[PDB]
Amino acid sequence: DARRLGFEPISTTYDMIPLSFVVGWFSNFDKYVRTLAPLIGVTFETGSQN
Amino acid sequence: PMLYKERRETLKMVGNRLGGLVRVAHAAQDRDLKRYFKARRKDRRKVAEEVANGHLELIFGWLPLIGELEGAIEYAELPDLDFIRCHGLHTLVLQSTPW
Amino acid sequence: LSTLPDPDVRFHADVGLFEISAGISLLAQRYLKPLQRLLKRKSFFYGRT
């Protein structure tokens, strides 16, 4: 997933709860592992016959 | 699976520090808050402000760690690897004669 | 030799990725669920001061 902890330092007033971003980063990290999907690839380079 | 050893390591093993932040948080700014519940309204006007100020400082101090972790996570998304080679041979008897 | 035809490479896939999944799930139930439950009550706020 194109997210991996959005980060983005932002601060406001009367609308920013102290304990809120802590669990957010954990949830984002947990969801990032679910979207991970390895994708390998191979192609022919060169050969020979003796 | 043995090729993704170092990748999975640098991805998750070193990332334990990220989850470790929740431990200290729950141990400090959660269990020690019982004094606020048993406090009178006359003191809550200052207790809430002191808690908010203490939490904002911790958030500002731990914010660079999140950025560092996000920047280091990109290191595991570099398309780089070596190559693999194989071989094969076979024999077949043709003819023979004594001497 | 060159211009090799369409090969028939076979890969089993599904590497050892589910092992690390047990680590995050085990650490969350020990410190994430309790924190989320404790935060549900007496939710604090932040002002200008």
Curated annotation (Swiss-Prot), chain A:
Superkingdom assignment: Viruses
Mind telling me which residue stretches traverse the membrane in this protein? none
**Compartment list:** Virion
Q: How does it assemble?
A: Interacts with the host pilus.
Q: Which family does it belong to?
A: Belongs to the Leviviricetes maturation protein family.
The function of this protein is: The maturation protein is required for the typical attachment of the phage to the side of the bacterial F-pili. Binds to sequences located toward each end of the genome, hence circularizing it. The RNA genome-maturation protein A complex is released from the capsid upon host receptor binding. Maturation protein A enters the cell along with the viral RNA.
In its UniProt entry, what is this protein called? Answer: Maturation protein A
| Protein source organism | Pseudomonas phage PP7
Give the shown range, full length included. Answer: 301 to 350 of 449
